[PDB]
Amino acid sequence: LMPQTVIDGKKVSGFADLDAFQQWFGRPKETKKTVAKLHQVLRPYLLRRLKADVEKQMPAKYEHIVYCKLSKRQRFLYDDFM
Amino acid sequence: RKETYSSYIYKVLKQTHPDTGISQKSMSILNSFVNDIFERIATEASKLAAYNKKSTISAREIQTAVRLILPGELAKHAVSEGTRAVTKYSSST
Amino acid sequence: SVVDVPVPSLLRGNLRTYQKQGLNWLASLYNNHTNGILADEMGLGKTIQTISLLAYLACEKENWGPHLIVVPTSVLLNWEMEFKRFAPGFK
Amino acid sequence: LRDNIQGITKPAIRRLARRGGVKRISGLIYEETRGVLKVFLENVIRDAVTYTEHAKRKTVTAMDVVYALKRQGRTLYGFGG
Amino acid sequence: QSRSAKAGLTFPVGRVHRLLRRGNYAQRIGSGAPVYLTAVLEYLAAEILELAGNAARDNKKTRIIPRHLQLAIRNDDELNKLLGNVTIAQGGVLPNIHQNLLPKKS
Amino acid sequence: MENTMKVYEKLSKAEKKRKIIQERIRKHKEQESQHMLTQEERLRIAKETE
Amino acid sequence: PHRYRPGTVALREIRRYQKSTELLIRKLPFQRLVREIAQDFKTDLRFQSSAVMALQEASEAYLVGLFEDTNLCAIHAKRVTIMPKDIQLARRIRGERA
Numbered sequence: 001l002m003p004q005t006v007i008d009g010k011k012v013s014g015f016a017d018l019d020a021f022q023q024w025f026g027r028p029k030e031t032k033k034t035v036a037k038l039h040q041v042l043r044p045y046l047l048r049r050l051k052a053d054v055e056k057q058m059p060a061k062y063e064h065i066v067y068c069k070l071s072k073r074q075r076f077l078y079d080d081f082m
Numbered sequence: 083r084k085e086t087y088s089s090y091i092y093k094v095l096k097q098t099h100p101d102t103g104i105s106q107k108s109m110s111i112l113n114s115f116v117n118d119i120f121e122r123i124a125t126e127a128s129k130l131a132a133y134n135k136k137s138t139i140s141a142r143e144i145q146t147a148v149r150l151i152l153p154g155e156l157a158k159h160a161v162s163e164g165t166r167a168v169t170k171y172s173s174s175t
Numbered sequence: 176s177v178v179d180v181p182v183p184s185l186l187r188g189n190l191r192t193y194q195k196q197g198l199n200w201l202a203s204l205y206n207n208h209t210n211g212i213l214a215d216e217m218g219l220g221k222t223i224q225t226i227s228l229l230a231y232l233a234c235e236k237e238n239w240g241p242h243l244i245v246v247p248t249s250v251l252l253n254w255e256m257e258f259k260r261f262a263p264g265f266k
Numbered sequence: 267l268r269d270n271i272q273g274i275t276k277p278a279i280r281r282l283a284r285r286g287g288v289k290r291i292s293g294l295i296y297e298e299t300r301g302v303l304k305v306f307l308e309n310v311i312r313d314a315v316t317y318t319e320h321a322k323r324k325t326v327t328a329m330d331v332v333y334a335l336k337r338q339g340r341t342l343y344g345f346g347g
Numbered sequence: 348q349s350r351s352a353k354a355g356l357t358f359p360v361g362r363v364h365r366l367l368r369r370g371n372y373a374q375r376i377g378s379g380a381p382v383y384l385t386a387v388l389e390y391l392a393a394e395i396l397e398l399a400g401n402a403a404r405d406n407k408k409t410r411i412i413p414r415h416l417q418l419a420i421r422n423d424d425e426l427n428k429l430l431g432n433v434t435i436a437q438g439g440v441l442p443n444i445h446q447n448l449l450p451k452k453s
Numbered sequence: 454m455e456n457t458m459k460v461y462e463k464l465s466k467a468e469k470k471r472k473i474i475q476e477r478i479r480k481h482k483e484q485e486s487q488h489m490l491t492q493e494e495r496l497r498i499a500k501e502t503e
Numbered sequence: 504p505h506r507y508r509p510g511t512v513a514l515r516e517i518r519r520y521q522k523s524t525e526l527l528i529r530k531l532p533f534q535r536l537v538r539e540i541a542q543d544f545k546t547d548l549r550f551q552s553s554a555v556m557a558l559q560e561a562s563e564a565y566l567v568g569l570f571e572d573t574n575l576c577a578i579h580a581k582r583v584t585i586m587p588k589d590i591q592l593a594r595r596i597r598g599e600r601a
């Protein structure tokens with residue numbers, strides 16, 4: 001979004017050094033406050049919206065988990081491989 | 083540490099033609115042919131010296147090696163220029 | 176703050192309210208001369224909002240200049256289709 | 267290991283001949299060209315390998331290739347040596 | 348003062364002497380041999396470079412590239428005779444088409 | 454010396470043909486630059502494309 | 504539909520490829536070939552890219568020289584297509600085959 005740019009033969013930096021960014025945010029309950037500060041930083045650049053708030057037409061989403069037994073051949077190959 | 087003829091090649095080229103440049107590929111090719119011709123002349127002079135049983139290579143050895151290696155017209159002008167250079171150096175004493 | 180910029184006349188179909196809000200926010204970034212990241216929980220109409228932004232650039236700013244969009248291969252044709260659908264005036 | 271000599275594509279030979287200015291090529295040329303090429307490479311690489319053995323180094327170098335070519339009576343410029 | 352200057356030679360006559368001595372080509376080297384060799388090498392370089400530059404200018408280019416250098420060397424019969432066994436990387440080949448291959452009737 | 458003569462002649466003929474075609478293309482460029490597009494006609498073209 | 508006559512594209516590409524300088528044989532297949540050959544000569548010999556590139560240059564030069572010689576030879580037989588006999592004859596007269 002804000003890269004280093006050359007103007008009139010000179011370089012101008014648009015954004016903080018990656019190392020400084022890592023030092024401030026990446027190094028650290030404090031994680032919640034750091035994430036909140038990150039969100040604050042994004043606030044100019046980022047517009048975030050969620051389906052449930054935006055619309056209520058088709059909320060119906062369902063997730064199911066299926067358990068599968070290994071076939072004798074598959075079981076054998078798995079055991080052998082390990 | 084190493085050494086190369088590239089500097090002198092650039093110098094002489096500029097003296098012939100200030101506006102023209104050389105890439106490393108061409109520069110290395112030039113260095114290589116200069117090296118090859120130098121080895122050729124030196125080995126010919128070594129042979130001619132050993133054949134006449136002389137231990138000291140000389141202006142004569144190089145003269146005759148250049149006579150042999152270079153084509154006759156190119157040889158004639160090369161020897162002419164070499165003679166001029168040698169005589170001017172000797173006169174510098 | 177963000178200004179409720181006029182709806183582009185070139186708009187085909189109905190921008191939903193939230194899509195209008197997103198349009199206005201993009202136009203605000205343009206007026207601020209600032210680049211932006213736009214992340215919607217997928218399936219909200221990012222692409223129609225892109226159309227609406229370009230159309231706002233079209234009506235008010237007259238700037239149909241040669242804009243560039245770089246995109247995965249699969250969605251590319253769908254993008255072409257949606258350009259036809261939402262604003263067929265774009266070459 | 268499998269067959270690399272066939273791997274040199276027919277278009278490669280065709281374009282090489284194209285540089286040679288030949289109008290048309292009989293199909294049999296491809297096998298003969300491959301044989302000639304392989305023989306040449308065999309000789310050159312043999313010389314390069316023995317040179318590398320003499321150096322005692324495990325890696326062959328451009329210098330070894332230059333010396334191998336020179337021994338064959340072929341001179342290459344630009345790669346040094 | 349450098350011996351090159353006293354001779355008036357661009358190439359490093361001293362380095363040439365060093366190479367000839369170290370190069371074990373001969374037991375002894377007369378002081379006239381390095382100056383003669385140096386002058387010869389300088390002359391040859393002068394011609395080849397002149398030809399390369401002329402070729403480059405022909406292309407309307409200004410940096411000598413192996414294409415131009417190859418053209419230069421092969422254009423001169425006697426330089427070809429010297430370099431008849433020399434291959435130039437990226438040298439390419441001369442334009443050569445046989446008259447019998449040209450399209451249509453004469 | 455003959456190579457230098459050949460290249461010099463080539464350069465001179467190149468220069469003359471160059472300047473002639475330069476005049477031609479400059480006339481074409483100046484005659485093309487005159488064109489301009491108004492918003493209204495741009496819009497109508499848009500409608501046609503619509 | 505328009506279609507060039509046999510040999511028109513021939514000459515066209517002759518010109519084109521004669522002009523160009525770029526190396527003609529595909530790099531990776533050549534590298535595989537040379538690696539195999541070296542493995543035949545001695546196992547586990549490492550090759551850096553510069554060495555294979557130089558060898559590929561040399562190979563191209565040798566091949567193109569042979570092609571030139573064979574092209575000159577073939578037309579002497581009044582033909583315009585080279586045949587294997589031209590390859591073996593040229594190679595033998597070169598003193599490579601014998």
Ligand SMILES: Nc1ncnc2c1ncn2[C@@H]1O[C@H](COP(=O)(O)OP(=O)(O)O)[C@@H](O)[C@H]1O
Binds near residue numbers: 215216
């Ligand atoms: N106002 C609208 N009327 C009808 N369909 C719409 C409207 N806005 C968006 N859509 C549908 O929403 C879909 C979202 O597609 P797309 O924008 O590519 O996904 P995302 O919003 O995740 O980027 C589109 O295919 C479009 O058909």
Ligand code: BEF
Binds near residue numbers: 216
């Ligand atoms: F963000 Be989407 F669904 F392309």
Ligand SMILES: [Mg+2]
Binds near residue numbers: 222
């Ligand atoms: Mg999307």
